[PDB]
Each structure stands twice: as structure tokens, then as C-alpha cells.
From a paper:
Indeed, the activities of the D593E, D593G, and D593N mutants were reduced by 36-, 3300-, and 140-fold relative to wild-type for hydrolysis of 4NPGlc, respectively, and in the ranges of 250–900-, 20 000–36 000- and 39 000–44 000-fold for hydrolysis of oligosaccharides. The decreased activities were verified by kinetic analysis of D593A and D593N, which showed ∼30 000-fold decreases in the apparent kcat/Km values relative to wild-type. These data support the action of D593 as the catalytic acid in the reaction mechanism and indicate the mutants are slow enough catalysts to soak with substrates to obtain Michaelis-complex-like structures. In all structures, the acid/base residue was mutated to asparagine (D593N) or alanine (D593A). The D593A and D593N unliganded enzymes and D593N complexes crystallized in the space group P21212, isomorphous, with wild-type TxGH116 crystals, whereas the crystals of TxGH116 D593A in complex with cellobiose and laminaribiose crystallized in the P212121 space group and had 2 molecules in one asymmetric unit. The overall structures of unliganded TxGH116 D593A and D593N, and in particular the position of amino acid residues in the active sites, were similar. However, the loops of residues 523–534 and 583–597, the last containing the mutated acid/base residue, as well as the side chains of D452 and Q727 in the active site differed from those of wild-type TxGH116. The distance between the catalytic nucleophile E441 and mutated catalytic acid/base N593 in TxGH116 D593N (10.6 Å) was longer than the distance between E441 and the catalytic acid/base D593 in the wild-type TxGH116 structure (8.5 Å).
Author numbering: 31 to 428, 431 to 801
Write the structure that this text describes.
């Protein structure tokens, strides 16, 4: 490996061998069907709301999130980079697809598949990833840096449906070598969203944009239809000329054939036919190819950028609503703009790399932080793009000021912005894209007084329940299978209108968003204040025994819904105390004296009673009335965690919080698989896991990272990082279970998982407050 020295990969990049088999991978631990796409994954390409494309560490374009809200795992084999090399003095060169695999059927059988093992590495530090190719049959060593312009405090480039592939080639030998790099792509119009005739009318064109010191050559793969539908649009691939390289292309090869129409050209001398052909296809799949060819002398390096763009302007949800995607603000809505997007990337990618470096540098340059922590911090951000992200720029046929946004809980539980989950998972948004975060919270504020009296059948027990109660915050903002933003509370497994935690979490999120954006946004507090007061006032009505605290009912009524809480619980009770303190503070900011006095009075009574009912001398009891009331809960002081972040001070005595956190480390972490897998949710005082429910026996990855941040804030530095380390190890390490770029909600002691590709572990960013 002589190429690494010619590129700059950070030491904290996650690494794996190209073609590496992983032996220890986990699988779903539930009886019901659950997504398991394997460990062959990678960092995604594409901006927020653009649809994303997962290119895996084996080189394949395999995890397709282009249909917003859906996860489709299938390798499109025509989509590849390939290389040709010929040493000066040899009769023949060699050609090789840079993919560690081969097609299942006989399509593309002429291509050289099965990129060999131990011949290159994949690296990832989101939004960047890299491949290096160090192969005994390829005298010239190659590397590529691939990324999309995902940039904090930038709502423009961050939205773009584009990726850049910056190639570096170096000749460490003492002979001249001819080299070609080829990008192939299938015309994927009709891959989704088209009910019949899936390739019909697809056609490919070549664009040559020649100006001074810019030549770009690109293929635009579109359809002859000018219809404005979810399925229609364009893909483009292309390259920018650099000194010392020539460009060749092939506009049309058949992907549903043996591929030799293209490969006989490339494998001879790395130079394509330059054949244009705009003939539309009928049943056959078609694709395009863009190549560069160059000669490298001994010791010579060259850099050449390729790009990929996709203009699919309309997203459609299962309930029928069609919306324009955010990037259409910058490029248009007609679906004929892929070249414009590609050109912007090829002319500006160096600027974008520097913008990414500028945001990563403060963390990467901090030598007090271990590299593993940086690995997790950056790579967990994959989910912001990969989580079915929806970001609208108008309803099809509709202009408003704001652009609604949603991130999925996950794909198995296909709900947008699940409130309980975003209480943990929304840290990167408030910290790095706060205008999005505040928009999402205004969306929630708008729902507070919505009433929908129609009943639905509750999944868990078959009871009928009211859809949406006035004054109760919704569980979620809809599903991609239905009507995101329009039809809320798509979730039906339980009834969230009786939950005792959501209204408090909502209030805490509001005050968080004010505090973490500088305590200056009084207009945001003004917009949300009525909903805050409503939320707390409705919760107060659920105090049955008049101790000042809403009562858990011993039936599903908070996020740990099968792990029953009854009476006053540490979890809901602490969240309540913190929400009351937050609302007092908002009251002072907005000069709402009567609110300040009321919530101060409620707070004083509740705090007193919480302490008497639950403090046992070592930790806070799980609750007052369950059979498992003395369980040590990892999340017992979630309200105090958020109070630290919101700078609300002590809601509980410092000494008791310290004892509680120490107990949690001692038990839930260190007595669970030797502290190497995170914090199990529930443990009995005898040191054995609470077996009263499956949820108690799970580590929740996002709960564990949040607990680590709480420990960190309280000065328990070793315990904080040791606690978080288990989650990193399980996710990314060779000794873990192979969950990179699909971090799940939970695992059990065997390492097997529930709900891969989950929002909650974005909570690692609470460690950066
Ligand atoms: Ca009560």
C-alpha cells in the first residue's frame, strides 16, 4: 500500500477489507419478520430529502433509499467503477470491475468480476468514504474519495442529490503504465414507482460542456415522457477533464445482456467508442459509460473527479400525496436538471471538501478524545440522510414560507419523527441544522389541539381507542405508507393519548431548542408557548392520588410500554419535574407571571414527593407500585439528564444523582456482559437482569449514549466513555455484531438485535454539548 500516503484519510475512519467476510454478524431477535440486509453496507451518498444511495464496502450500489421512506436492498450490477491497466512493453492489458462479487444471473457475464480479497480497503468517516486498491495485478495503485456535501448550518448543498468520486492514481513502479477508469450506470428510471413497462421510453444522451479550462462530459439517462410523476426524472454520471487525461464514452449499452457491447472496448485498451445513440428502449435495460484514460510515468500522481446526480423531483407517499423534494428549490421541479446538478458538483467539489474538513476539524483535532469515539460520532450521522428523510418544497399542484421535514424512526416501524425517539435522537439537528430542528418542533406545536374522535383498533390488545386527543402530543407525524405531516399518529400498537412521558418530552425539547441555539430565539418560545402550557396542564389531570405527579397506570402508558410502570415512576416523574422547571423558565422569559407561579408551585410539591416516594438510599426506585419496583433502571433520571443540558440546575440532590449514576454503571453496565455491550435497561438489586419484560433485558443504544453524556456532564468521565464504548464496539469493531451503517434500537445479551437503521443512537451527539 503506497497510495495511502497520496491521500488524506483520518485515523478515526472506520475500516474494513474490500471483500472481507464477517463471521460474527447479528440477526433479529424477535419472532415477527424484521429487516436484515446483512453486514455488506457502507456510508450513504445523497443529501437530506434527496433519496440516498448506499454504496457498500464491497463496491456495489446496493442499499436504495431513493423511494422516500422505503429501504430496498439489491445490487444494481451495471453500476460500477472499473479499471484497465497496461504496462508499456506488454502486448495485453488487464481490466477489472471494482466490485468484490458477481451477478447472480448471466447479465453482464462478459465483465471481469470478483475483485480479489486482500487487495484494498474501505474507509468511512461520514460524509466521506474512501476505497484503496492495492492489487498485485494492478501496478498503478488507485484510491477514491466519495462524498456528498453534507454541511452543518448549510440547508442548500446539504439537500443535493449528488455524489462526487475524486480519484487518485499513483505509479510506484519503474515502467510507464496506461490507465483507464470507467464509471458505468444503469438508466434506473422505472426502478421504482412505475406500475407497468418499467424500461419503456428510457433513453440516454451525452452532454459535452466545453468552456475555457472546463470540459465536462456527462451522460443523462432519462425517459422520453415529460410527465410529472414520482418515477420520472433523470440520472447523470460524468467527469471533468484534467491535464493529462482523455475522456471517452458510450451512451448506450444493454444492461439486460452480456455486457460485451461495452466490455470488448474497455478491455482492449481502456478506450470507449464515443458512440452517441438516443434511441429509446422498449423492454431492455440500458446504461451509459464514462471513462478516462491516461499514461502515468514512474512516480507520477494524477487526480480526476467523477460525479453522479439524480433528479427525481417528486416523492409520493402511500396515501397518495405527492411533494417536491427540497433540492428543487435550487435546480427546478421539471425533472430535467440532472446535468445542472452534476456540473455544480464537478465545478465546486474542492470547496465542498474544505467545508466538510472545516466542520470536522474541531473534533478531529482534539487529541483528548479517543479515535473510536470520533468514529462513532461522525458515522452515526449517516442516519440523517439514510433515515427516509423527507423535506418538502411544495405539494404537487399547490407557496409557503417553511419546508416541512421528517426523519423516520426506522424502516421496520415506519413513523416520521416519533416524539419519544427524537427526544434522544434529534441532538445532531439542534446542534448542526437548528433551522430544521425548530421547524420540526413547530410541526409538533401545531398538532397539540388537534382532535380526531374516530377510533382505531389497538394492536397489542385489540381494544378500540381514540386516534388523537386534544392536548396530548402525538406519537408521530405519520407514515410514508400513508400521509406524512397530514395524518398524524400512524402508530397503532398502543394508544399514545394516555402516555405519561410524551407531553413532558415535548416541553423539554422546546426549551432544549431555545437553550442550545443561544437563548436568543424568543419568537420560537412565543410560537410554542400555548402548546407547552396545554401539554403540562393535560398531564397534571392524570395525577390520581394528588401527590403532584402524573400516575402511571400499570398498562402501556410510556415509551417502555411493555415494561409496565405503575404509580410514580422514576422515568416519567423525573421528566415531569424537568418539564415543570423548563416551563417556569419560559414563563420568566415571556413574562407570563401566572404560568411561572403555577408551574413553580406544581414543581415544589412534585419534587418533594418524588424524592420521598422513590429515593432508596442508593438509587431511585423504578416506580412505587409495580412488582419490579426496586429495579435499577438505566434511564431512571432522564429528566435530570435533560435538566443538565438545559442548564436548569438540580432537580434532585447532587449527591443522590451521583450515587444513582454510579449504581447504574456498577450494575446495568458492569454486571451486563462485563460492561462491553452498553447499559441493559433493567437490573435487579441482586445483580441479575430484570426478566419481567423483554425491554428490561435489552440495551437501547440511544439510551446508552444519552446515559454516557449524563455521566460525562456529572464528571464520571471514565464511566461515560466505558459505557459508550460498548455501543461502539458492538456496532463497528471486529469483535462486535456487524451493525455499521445500520445501528439498531436494541440488542440482547447474545448480541442479536431489534430494529436496524434506527434514529435513537444519534443521541451520541449529546456527548458534544
Ligand atoms: Ca400522582
Amino acid at each position: 500500500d503506497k497510495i495511502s500516503h497520496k491521500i488524506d484519510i483520518p485515523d478515526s475512519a472506520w475500516t474494513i477489507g474490500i471483500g472481507e467476510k464477517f463471521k460474527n454478524a447479528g440477526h433479529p431477535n424477535v419472532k415477527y419478520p424484521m429487516i436484515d440486509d446483512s453486514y455488506v453496507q457502507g456510508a450513504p451518498l445523497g443529501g437530506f430529502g434527496a433519496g440516498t444511495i448506499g454504496r457498500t464496502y464491497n463496491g456495489g450500489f446496493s442499499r436504495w433509499h431513493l423511494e422516500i421512506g422505503k429501504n430496498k436492498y439489491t445490487t444494481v450490477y451495471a453500476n460500477q467503477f472499473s479499471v484497465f491497466q497496461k504496462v508499456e512493453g506488454n502486448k495485453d492489458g488487464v481490466a477489472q470491475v471494482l466490485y468484490a462479487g458477481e451477478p447472480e444471473n448471466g447479465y453482464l457475464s462478459s465483465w471481469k468480476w470478483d475483485y480479489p480479497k486482500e487487495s484494498g480497503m474501505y474507509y468511512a468517516l461520514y460524509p466521506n468514504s474512501w476505497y484503496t486498491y492495492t492489487n498485485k495485478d494492478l501496478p498503478v495503485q488507485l484510491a477514491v474519495k466519495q462524498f456528498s456535501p453534507i454541511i452543518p448550518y448549510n440547508y442548500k448543498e446539504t439537500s443535493y442529490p449528488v455524489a462526487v468520486f475524486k480519484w487518485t492514481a499513483y505509479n510506484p513502479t519503474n515502467k510507464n503504465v496506461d490507465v483507464s477508469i470507467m464509471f458505468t450506470w444503469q438508466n434506473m428510471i422505472g426502478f421504482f414507482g412505475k406500475q407497468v413497462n418499467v424500461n419503456s421510453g428510457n433513453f440516454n444522451k451525452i452532454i459535452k460542456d466545453k468552456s475555457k479550462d472546463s470540459e465536462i462530459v456527462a451522460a443523462v439517462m432519462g425517459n422520453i415522457s415529460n410527465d410529472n410523476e414520482e418515477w420520472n426524472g433523470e440520472y447523470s454520471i460524468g467527469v471533468k477533464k484534467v491535464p493529462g487525461v482523455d475522456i471517452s464514452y458510450k451512451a448506450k449499452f444493454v444492461t439486460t445482456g452480456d455486457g460485451s457491447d461495452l466490455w470488448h472496448e474497455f478491455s482492449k485498451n481502456g478506450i470507449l467508442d464515443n458512440k452517441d445513440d438516443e434511441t429509446p428502449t422498449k423492454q431492455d435495460g440500458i446504461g451509459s459509460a464514462i471513462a478516462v484514460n491516461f499514461k502515468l510515468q514512474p512516480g507520477q500522481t494524477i487526480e480526476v473527479p467523477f460525479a453522479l446526480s439524480w433528479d427525481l423531483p417528486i416523492m409520493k407517499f402511500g396515501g397518495g400525496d405527492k411533494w417536491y423534494k427540497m433540492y428543487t428549490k435550487y435546480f427546478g421541479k421539471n425533472g430535467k436538471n440532472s446535468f445542472a446538478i452534476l456540473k455544480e458538483a464537478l465545478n465546486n467539489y474542492q470547496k465542498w471538501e474544505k467545508m466538510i474538513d472545516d466542520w470536522q476539524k474541531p473534533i478531529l483535532s482534539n487529541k483528548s478524545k479517543p479515535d473510536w469515539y470520533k468514529t462513532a460520532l461522525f458515522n452515526e450521522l449517516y442516519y440523517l440522510a439514510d433515515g427516509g428523510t423527507a423535506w418538502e418544497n411544495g405539494k404537487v399542484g399547490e407557496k409557503r414560507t417553511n419546508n416541512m421535514f421528517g426523519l423516520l424512526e426506522c424502516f421496520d416501524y415506519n413513523y416520521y419523527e416519533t416524539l419519544d425517539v427524537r427526544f434522544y435522537g434529534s441532538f445532531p439537528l439542534v446542534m448542526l441544522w437548528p433551522d430544521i430542528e425548530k421547524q420540526v418542533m413547530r410541526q409538533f406545536a401545531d398538532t397539540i389541539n388537534v382532535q380526531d374522535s374516530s377510533e382505531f383498533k389497538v394492536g397489542s390488545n385489540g381494544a378500540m381507542a381514540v386516534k388523537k386527543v386534544q392536548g396530548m402530543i402525538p406519537h408521530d407525524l405519520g407514515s410514508s405508507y400513508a400521509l406524512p405531516w397530514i395524518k398524524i399518529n400512524a402508530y397503532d400498537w398502543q394508544n399514545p393519548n394516555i402516555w405519561k412521558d410524551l407531553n413532558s418530552k415535548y416541553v423539554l425539547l422546546v426549551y432544549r431548542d431555545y437553550v442550545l441555539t443561544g437563548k436568543t430565539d424568543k419568537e420560537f418560545l412565543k410560537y410554542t408557548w400555548k402548546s407547552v402550557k396545554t401539554a403540562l396542564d393535560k398531564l397534571k389531570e392524570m395525577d390520581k392520588d394528588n401527590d403532584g405527579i402524573p400516575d402511571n397506570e400499570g398498562i402501556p402508558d410510556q415509551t417502555y410500554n411493555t415494561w409496565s410502570m405503575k404509580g410514580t415512576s422514576a422515568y416519567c416523574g423525573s421528566l415531569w419535574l424537568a418539564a415543570l422547571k423548563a416551563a417556569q423558565e419560559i414563563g420568566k422569559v415571556l413574562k407570563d407571571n401566572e404560568a411561572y407561579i403555577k408551574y413553580n408551585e406544581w414543581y415544589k410539591i412534585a419534587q418533594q414527593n418524588f424524592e420521598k416516594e422513590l429515593w432508596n438510599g442508593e438509587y431511585y426506585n423504578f416506580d412505587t407500585e409495580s412488582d419490579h419496583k426496586d429495579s435499577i433502571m438505566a434511564d431512571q433520571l432522564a429528566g435530570q439528564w435533560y435538566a443538565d443540558i438545559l442548564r436548569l440546575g438540580d432537580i434532585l440532590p447532587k449527591d443522590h444523582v451521583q450515587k444513582a449514576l454510579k449504581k447504574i454503571y456498577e450494575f446495568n453496565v458492569m454486571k451486563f456482559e462485563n460492561g462491553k455491550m452498553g447499559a441493559v435497561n433493567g437490573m435487579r438489586p441482586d445483580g441479575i437482569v430484570d426478566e419481567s419484560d423483554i425491554q428490561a433485558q435489552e440495551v437501547w443504544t440511544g439510551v446508552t449514549y444519552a446515559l454516557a453524556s449524563f455521566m460525562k456532564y456529572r464528571g464520571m468521565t471514565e464511566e461515560a466513555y466505558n459505557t459508550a464504548y460498548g455501543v461502539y464496539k458492538m456496532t463497528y469493531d471486529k469483535s462486535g455484531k456487524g451493525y455499521w451503517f445500520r445501528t439498531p434500537e436494541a440488542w440482547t445479551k447474545d448480541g442479536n438485535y431489534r430494529a436496524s437503521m434506527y434514529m435513537r443512537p444519534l443521541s451520541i451527539w449529546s456527548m458534544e454539548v
